[PDB]
Each structure stands twice: as C-alpha cells, then as structure tokens.
Symmetry: C4
Subunit: 229 residues, 4 copies
C-alpha cells in the first residue's frame, strides 16, 4: 500500500531530522561532556541504520529526496512514486524540526536564529568559513557517493540484509568529512526542516541544498547504473 | 520455560544498568581521557546489542518495562507475561545499581546523592537545565521511536538476525540526542535502579520516568501495529 | 588440526594486545587529538571483532584464558585443549607487547615503568584511585558478563554469523565501564603481556588478574549452562 | 568485465582517500568540536565498510595495492589482474586528493605543504616524533594483520556477508593504534595521493609507504595461506 510506505518515509525522515539535528542542537557543544561533530555524525548514520532496518522492508527506506530521485535515475524506483515520497519526507522532517524547536526552547537562552538551528549553509554560513565552491564540490561528491553506496549495497548480488549498516554508516562517514564545510546536507528534506525555524539565511541558501544534493544523487545513480551494475 | 526468560530479562537489565550507568558514573567525566556523553551513549546501546544477541532468543530481550508494554500494545507480546518481565527487569536493575554503588564507593569523594548517581531528572535536575515540557516531549518521542524501531526491526519481513544491531544502536542514538535533557530514560527499570541509591530528588521525579516512557512505548507500538505493519 | 587453532589463538591474542594496549600507549593521551578511553575501548572490541571473524571458524576465537576456561566450565570446550590455548594466548600477547615496547621506545621520553605500559592495577595502581574491592567486583561482574554474552551469542538458537559483533562490542562496552577502575583486564594473557615490560608493580598485582577474570569467566559459563541454556 | 572491476576499484579508492584524508584535513582539529584521531579512524574504516558492501561483489573491493598484492601472495587473486587494480587504485586516490585540495583551499589559510595534507611520514614527519624503526615495525605489523583479517574474513568457512564489517572495522582499529606513529598508511595508493599535493617531504618519504605496506601485506597473506587456511 502506498499509504504505509509514505507513512514509513514520513516517520523515517522525522527520525533522521529529530536525531541528527536533535543531537547537534541539544548535545554537540554541551560543556565538557558534549558529543562533538563525531557524535553528531554517529547520530546521523544511526537514524538511517535504525529506520532502514525498521521500515526499509516497507518503503525502501529513502528518508531523503536525493535518495528517491537518485534511485529513480539509477533505474531502481519508479517516476510515479517520487513526488509522494518527497512530500512525505519533507513533512516528516518539518514535524521533527518543530518538536525539536519546542524541546530546545525549554532551556534558557535558546535562539534558533542566532545558533543557526543546525541549518546547512555556505560562505559566511559554513561552520568553518568555506567558500560556495568548496560547499558545492563536497556536497556533490558526497551526494554522489551516498547514492553509489545505496545502489551497490542493494544490488542483486550484494549480500542480503546488510544494506542498512552500509547506508547508515555511509551517512556517519559523510558527516565526519563535511560538517565543517556545510554542516552536511546530502538531503533536501533535512535542510528545509530546520531552515524554516532558523528563519533567515538558512531560507536564503536553501535552494543550494535542494539543487546540489539532487544533482549529486542523480550522478551517483547514473554512475552505478551505467558503469558498475 | 518462563523462569529462564525471566532470568534472561533479569541478567539483561542488570547488564544494561551496570554498563550504561556504570560508564556514566565511573568514566564519562574522567579528567582529560573520560568518555563523555558520546561514550556513555555508545555503552548504552552496546548493553542492549550484546544482551539482545546473547539472550534475545530466550526472552525476546526487552530489558525495559516500556519495551515489554509497548510490544504488548503492538500485539507482539501477551498480557499474561508482562508483569513478570517488568519485575525481573526492575530486580535486575536494582542489583546492578547496588554493585555499581559499591564499586563507585571505592574511590575517595564518591557521593551518590550529590552526583545524582546517573539518575534521570527534569527541571532543576535536567543535566542541561531543560524544562519539564522539554523532558516530556523528548522522552515521549524517543520512547515511541524506540518502540517503532523494535517493532519494525523484528517484523516478519525484516531480515533475520539484525534486530539486535538496529535496536541497540537505536539506544545509542536515543542517548546521543537526549542525555542533556533528562539524562535519557526511555526505561523505567533504568530510572528506578539508580534513583533508589541517589535517594532524594531522583525518587521524587521517578513517577515521570515510569509514566512517560510507557505511554511513549505504547504509542510507538500502536503506530506500527495500526499504520505500518 | 590443533596446530592451526593454536596459531589462530596466538595471532589473535597478539592482535588483541597489540591493538588494545597499542592504542592506549601510542594514542589515548595524544595532545589535543588523542583518542581517550572511548577510543581505547573501541580498539579493544575491534581487535576481537576483527579476529573473531578472521579466525573464529578455526579456533573458536577465544584470545583470552578466561574465555577458554569459562567455555570449559560452560560445557562448550574440552578440558584437554585448554592449557594449549592458554599457552598460545600468553605467547601471542607477550610478542605483541614486545613489538609494542619497541615501537613506543622510538619516541623521546618513553618509559614503560613510569607510564605503567597500559598494565592493569588496583589501589595505588588503579587509574582512578579505586580500592581493591572496587577492582574485584568490577572485574568479576564484567568477566562473568563477557562469558554470558559469549555463551549466548554462540548458542545453537542464536542467529549464525553475528557472534563476532556481539562479543567484540561487548569488550568495548566492558572497557567503557571499567578502564578507570583497573584499566580493564577481563583477560590474563592481556595483563601478563604488558606487566612483564612494566616490570614492577604490574608483576606484583598480576595474580589478581589471573584469579579474578578466570573465576568470573567460570561464573558466567555456569550461569548460562545452568540457568539460561 | 575487467573494466567495471577497475571502475569499482577506482571509485572505491577515491571514496577511501576522500573520506579518510578528507575527514583529517577538514574535521580532525576543528576547534572545540573537531573529531580527533578517533573520528578520523572511524571515517577510515567506514570508507572501506561502505564501499566493500557497495562494490565488493564487483571487484573484490581491495581499494589498496597492499591488499591486491597480499591477496595475490595468499593465493586468492591472480597475478594477471594485479597491475590494473593498482593503477585503478592510484588514479582513484589522486582524483580524490585533488577534489579535496580544491575543497580545502576554499578556507582562508589552507596550506597543503605546511599542514602536511594528511601525508604519511616518519621521523621529523611522524605526527608524534617516532623514529623510522618505530614506523617500520608498526606499518609492517598492521599491514600484515590487515591482510590476515582480509584472508580469514573471506575464507570459505567464514560466514558469508560480514567481511565488509570485519575488514572496514579492522582499518579503524589500525588507525586508532598508528596515526601517531606514521599518520597510518597500510596503503600505497593512500600515501601517494596526498603526498603529490603536499609536494615536499611527503614525496621524499613515499617509497617507505610503498615498500613496507606491500611487504607487510605479502607476509600477512603468507601467514594465512601457509599456517591458518
Ligand atoms: C516547503 C517549504 C519551503 C519554504 C521555502 C520558502 C522560501 C522563503 O524565502 C525567504 O523568506 C523569508 C521571509 O520570511 C526571508 O528571510 C528571505 O529573504 C526569503 O528568501
Ligand atoms: C518540496 C518543498 C520545497 C521546495 C524547495 C524550496 C526552495 C526554496 O528556495 C529559496 O527560495 C527563496 C525565494 O523566495 C529565495 O529567496 C532563496 O534564496 C532560496 O533558498
Ligand atoms: C529547487 C529549488 C530552485 C532551484 C533552481 C536553480 C537555480 C537557482 O539559482 C539561484 O537562485 C537564488 C535565489 O533563489 C539566487 O540567489 C542565485 O543567484 C541563483 O543563482
Ligand atoms: C520498586 C521500588 C520503587 C521505590 C519508590 C518509592 C518512592 C519513595 O518516595 C520518596 O521517598 C523518600 C523517603 O526516603 C523521599 O526522598 C521523597 O520525598 C519521597 O517522594
Ligand atoms: C515496579 C515497581 C515501581 C513502581 C513505580 C514507582 C513510582 C514511584 O513514584 C514516586 O512516588 C512517591 C510517592 O511516595 C512520590 O513522592 C514521587 O514524587 C514519585 O516519583
Ligand atoms: C506509575 C507511577 C505513578 C503514575 C501516576 C500518574 C499521575 C501522577 O501525577 C503526579 O504525581 C506526583 C507525585 O507522585 C506529583 O508530584 C504530581 O503533581 C502529580 O501530577
Ligand atoms: C608467564 C610469565 C609470568 C611472569 C610472572 C613472574 C612474577 C615476577 O614476580 C615479581 O618479580 C620482580 C623481579 O624482577 C619484582 O618486581 C616483584 O617483586 C616480583 O613480585
Ligand atoms: C600462564 C603463565 C603465567 C601464570 C600466572 C603468573 C602469576 C604471577 O603472580 C605474581 O607472582 C609473584 C611471585 O613471584 C608475586 O610476587 C606477585 O605478587 C604475583 O602477581
Ligand atoms: C594463578 C596465580 C596465583 C593465584 C593464587 C591465589 C591466591 C594468591 O593470594 C595472594 O598472593 C599474593 C602474592 O602472590 C599476595 O600478595 C596476597 O597477599 C595473596 O593473598
Ligand atoms: C604515481 C606518481 C608518483 C610520484 C612519485 C614522484 C617522486 C618525486 O620525487 C620528489 O620530487 C620533488 C620535485 O618536485 C622533490 O620535492 C623531491 O626532492 C623528490 O624526491
Ligand atoms: C604506482 C605509481 C607510483 C610508484 C611508486 C612511487 C615511488 C616514489 O618514491 C620516491 O622517489 C623519489 C625519486 O625521485 C625519491 O627522491 C623519494 O625519496 C621516494 O619517496
Ligand atoms: C617501489 C618504490 C621503490 C622501492 C625500492 C626499495 C629501496 C629504496 O631504498 C631507499 O630509497 C630512498 C630514495 O628512494 C633513499 O632515500 C634511501 O636511502 C634508500 O634506502
């Protein structure tokens, strides 16, 4: 049933934004004991590992408009189901961002706009001061690579069952490399969710984190489909 | 035999409290080399991963009254076995908390009451100063999500064998997000165990960490059963 | 062939001491970027995960005299092969400790005696100042629990293939809890290897880390065999 | 088809250098939140875990001239395919190093030569001041051990599917031990890639990190083939 797959994609994407962004906003910078980028990166991949095992057998477990569209371009997913996944994914992420904003507001001094609310940005809004070109190349390469890993790990001849470990851990890796550059998107639903609550520059740069992750995912699906499969 | 399943749940829950709380009390804040929240979060999920692989095939490996009751509500576990699991779980956790208190007392300056002995709390007793509403929402969402992941990872059509990785790592993730908010419960046996030895406010707020994790687990079982399965 | 199993146990135990102790001596305290106890704990479990997958199908992959003897007591391993495993394990660990001492000496200021060379100790020689009773209880409980996890993860009805993940990660967990107490033994071959090169108090307390890990392993094998299996 | 296997080895090795070196150059030392050696070590192993699951079923997933040649020496891979793998691997790594250098240049003050651009070195160029002998022994032992783990984890009687976890995590472990000594090579393609852009001493010491990782891999393949298999 399409409706359960959509529900799976919705809950899945909530889990991803709530855990990934949640761990950044609530836990990364906690004084002395905070989890850092490494811990945020771990949380990211675990959201996908845990939900891909929980609901992958229902929707395919994309939880990411760049995954859905890259699987489309890779010949693994039908055109007709794409938009519904992307919508489910966005809604899921917004609901998680909203519950997170509520949780974060329960601590004195919380300020979504000034902290950035874990939004992805480049230039002045890159966590490490990286240029827009730096942001483009990193997001493109890692979106491509994420898709190449998803395609291959779910290949016919790939050992059955492990895809959720491969894919989720691939997202940890992605974050271990790129947080300093863009705060790591590779996911338009993820960038949209928190940008809405950040409410300023995150909305002005949001288009970047629709365009680049998607193109990158497309490229990754094409590489697998035409050169590897 | 019910007796071995109870024993499995008892040893399992001891392993969870001893490792999870043990790593927090003995190792989180160790000067210069201590493991932080990220390391506590890792320990948490590994207690469940390791025991779910060790004794999951005996009891189902709940190790958590919110898991048992959420599996009940999800239609995966019988009413008649619930109370015995919960009792086993509580006893297991108390024995671990007691052996831990003994281990911790062997270091000059240990003080269960003043340190909090890894107890879950909100408000004044949240590690990060988060309100009661912040604590409710986080514990509710993550208890629900823990149950959704348990249900899905053990679904008929979920690949056999991986559930312990999915579930245990889901608990790491849960801790990576919420330690700052409540010290992370999602488990009434876990909160009760150490609150007894903390012996003050942890006992006054303990009811919260029975009610919220259970309701949350219930909701998660209901979501899976009615919308996903 | 017994000879290959011994060789597997020997190489295995070298891998464990070289990686576990190696990461502590070379990397834990590296200024600013060092890996801490959490990273040492991760290295520990990965030595066992990686070798249990590499040579578990040859020897059973014990790499630990407390594992061999606890599997004996659990009815999973024959008396007649025990001593040969323990010998293989000790030799393996000593060779790793020797190559490590050589590697560590290649940096100005290295001093095995004064640093402790990653040796296990209690009292004055506990990393965190914990008493002998604290050391006994922690080592006993965690040795028992390690054995309970090994027995269960390799149970007939335990899903085939995952034991190396369960067991190796159980050792990470063990280290996440107890490094501050004893530097974490649960392994007489591991304690002997480096105590020889530390060459002072580590040799005076070594008996503790033969007796306690073994008794603990025995207890864990007995718990599984009589109450769980 | 040889061409796809080469492409798999090429993309694979790019993924390894881009993630491993990428995480070091972009994220290790990030102020306050940076990922450290432990996080770099995790990234390393995840590059191999993720690509071995994605393309292992295509090429065998070596991503490392020391792996290819050690599998040769172990009797697991034909002489005639070796050079093509090594070439693919080197090209892959250089392309990743180039895209990384471009990403890193987008931040004020980046200087590949002075930072070392994550190059492997010994002596004056060891991160921790370790001698050349220290560097030889560590790289030899860990290259050998990496190969022993690869051989065993892919043995006939090794449980099917887990090799990518065993091998990838073995690389994390390798890095947890040796970064301080050499920045961890065990991979000539990895050392060559960044040495080209470092452009000074990294090129003068590069031969070391061809010779030692290869000899070590050879030894590891020989140990398995003659003593364990
Ligand atoms: C699915 C929801 C996507 C939301 C995209 C909306 C883009 C908003 O656009 C932004 O609006 C803000 C006005 O409040 C301003 O801060 C910015 O100048 C403007 O670019
Ligand atoms: C699927 C639902 C969301 C679709 C993509 C949202 C793209 C938002 O794009 C944003 O639009 C603004 C225009 O108002 C511009 O001012 C911003 O610069 C741009 O980031
Ligand atoms: C899917 C979301 C829209 C993607 C359209 C691709 C081209 C967008 O192009 C960009 O739009 C920005 C404002 O939106 C401007 O600030 C940039 O100058 C413009 O280059
Ligand atoms: C299964 C065991 C559950 C124990 C729940 C008992 C609740 C105790 O209640 C508490 O008792 C303390 C008196 O010692 C006081 O600190 C508190 O004011 C009181 O709320
Ligand atoms: C299964 C065994 C334990 C059941 C749940 C214990 C709930 C304890 O609840 C506690 O009770 C006290 C009443 O004395 C109150 O004062 C505290 O505020 C409350 O946290
Ligand atoms: C299972 C444990 C009891 C849960 C009962 C749900 C309602 C409890 O309600 C709460 O009890 C606390 C004291 O116990 C009071 O401090 C709070 O004001 C009260 O709201
Ligand atoms: C398998 C190898 C086990 C070695 C155990 C030997 C116990 C050594 O015993 C120790 O010897 C040292 C003398 O050099 C002294 O530092 C100590 O006082 C003494 O207890
Ligand atoms: C299997 C090979 C090693 C067997 C166990 C070694 C036990 C060493 O035991 C050591 O012996 C010394 C006696 O000289 C005592 O002085 C020390 O206190 C004690 O730690
Ligand atoms: C297997 C290694 C020997 C274990 C024997 C168990 C009893 C050892 O007993 C201990 O031996 C130590 C010196 O060895 C003394 O310092 C202690 O006082 C003594 O209690
Ligand atoms: C596959 C590509 C391998 C490149 C190996 C080339 C070895 C370069 O050699 C180096 O060249 C530099 C001149 O630019 C100098 O810094 C060094 O003195 C010299 O050793
Ligand atoms: C497969 C393509 C690369 C082959 C190995 C490159 C080995 C480079 O070796 C380098 O060569 C230089 C000679 O110019 C010496 O000066 C350096 O000391 C040495 O590191
Ligand atoms: C595959 C790359 C070449 C390996 C050849 C093995 C012997 C190299 O030998 C070394 O070469 C270096 C310059 O290249 C010199 O600095 C050293 O003194 C020399 O020992």
């Amino acid at each position: 049933h399409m409706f359960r797959k959509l529900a799976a994609e919705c809950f899945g994407t909530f889990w991803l934004v709530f855990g990934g962004c949640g761990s950044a906003v609530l836990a990364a910078g906690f004084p002395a004991l905070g989890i850092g980028f490494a811990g945020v990166a771990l949380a990211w991949g675990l959201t996908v590992l845990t939900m891909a095992f929980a609901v992958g057998h229902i929707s395919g477990g994309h939880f990411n408009p760049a995954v859905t569209i890259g699987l489309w371009a890779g010949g693994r997913f039908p055109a007709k189901e794409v938009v519904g996944y992307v919508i489910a994914q966005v809604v899921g992420g917004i609901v998680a961002a909203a519950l997170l904003y509520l949780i974060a507001s329960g601590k004195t001094g919380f300020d979504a706009a000034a902290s950035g609310f874990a939004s992805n940005g480049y230039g002045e809004h890159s966590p490490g001061g990286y240029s827009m070109l730096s942001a483009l190349v990193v997001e493109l390469v890692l979106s491509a690579g994420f898709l190449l890993v998803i395609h291959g790990a779910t290949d016919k001849f790939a050992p059955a069952g492990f895809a959720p470990i491969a894919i989720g851990l691939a997202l940890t890796l992605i974050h271990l490399i790129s947080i300093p550059v863009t705060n790591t998107s590779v996911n338009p639903a993820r960038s949209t969710a928190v940008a809405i609550f950040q409410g300023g520059w995150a909305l002005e740069q949001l288009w970047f984190f629709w365009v680049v992750p998607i193109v990158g995912g497309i490229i990754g699906g094409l590489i697998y489909r035409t050169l590897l499969e």
